[PDB]
Structure 1
Amino acid sequence: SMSVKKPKRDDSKDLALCSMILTEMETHEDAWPFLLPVNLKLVPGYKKVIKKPMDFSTIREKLSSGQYPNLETFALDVRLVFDNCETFNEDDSDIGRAGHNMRKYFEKKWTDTFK
């Protein structure tokens, strides 16, 4: 509360460390469905159904330009990528499986780096 603060957690490396995680996600062999924004002209249904499209390139641009106020808003966009994928793709598809694998990969890196 006013003039009463928990001890200051060192967040000075968070930007660098989120960048490294995002690099590792970018270079994963199953990243290919997630590298670029879904083409809303060429994928019937996507625009209407997926209210907040997100992809790795868009996260990378947001990260590089100071549009994440803290490491949690960064994790929310990463998870959004996989939530969108599960909304649109059957579990038993190449893209559906890719999304599950990537989410697992991300959540381990996240825990090991920050928890």
Structure 2
Amino acid sequence: SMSVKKPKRDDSKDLALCSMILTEMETHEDAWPFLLPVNLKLVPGYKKVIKKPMDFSTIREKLSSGQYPNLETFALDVRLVFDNCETFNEDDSDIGRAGHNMRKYFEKKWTDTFKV
């Protein structure tokens, strides 16, 4: 409360660390469904169904331009990519399984990097 401050973690490296995690995401062999925005006019239904599209390049743009207030808003956008993927694709479709794989990969790197 007022004039009573809880110790807060050192967040000085958060930008660099999220950037490094994102780079690893981007280089993963299963990243291809998520590298660029979905072709809004080539994937029928995607525009109406997916209310908040997100993808790695858009996350990179936002990260590079100071559009994430904190590391948690960055994680929200990454998870959004995979939540959207789950909504639209079958679990055992190539794109669906890629999403599950990428999510697992992200959450471990997230835990390992920040859950000190």
> Segments of 4+ in structure 1 off by > 4 A?
none
- Determine whether 1:41 maps to 2:51: no
1:110 positional shift: 0.2
5+ residue gaps in structure 1? none
1:8, CA displacement in angstroms?
Answer: 2.9
**Offset of residue 14 of structure 1:** 0.2
Deviations 1:52-78 (A, max 9, x none): 000000000000000000000000000
More divergent stretch after superposition (4-13 vs 46-55): 4-13
The corresponding residue for 1:73 is: 73
Tell me the CA shift for residue 9 of structure 1.
1.1
Q: Look up the SS of the partner of 1:101 in the other structure.
A: helix
Query: How many residues align structurally?
Result: 115
Paired-residue identity, %: 100
Q: Scaled by the length of structure 1, what TM-score is found?
A: 0.99
User: How many angstroms does 1:47 deviate by?
Assistant: 0.3
TM-score normalised according to structure 2 size:
0.98
Unaligned runs of 5+ in 2: none
Moved more, 36-45 or 66-75: 36-45
Q: Equivalents in 2 of 1:112, 1:92: separation in Å?
A: 28
Distance 1:74 1:8 in 2: 18
- Distance in 2 between the 1:65 and 1:34 partners? 20
RMSD: 0.4
Q: Once the two structures are superposed, what CA deviation does each residue of 1:71-108 show, in whole Å capped at 9, x if it has no partner?
A: 00000000000000000000010000000000000000
Tell me the SS of whatever aligns to 1:100: helix
The structure where helix makes up a greater share of residues is 2
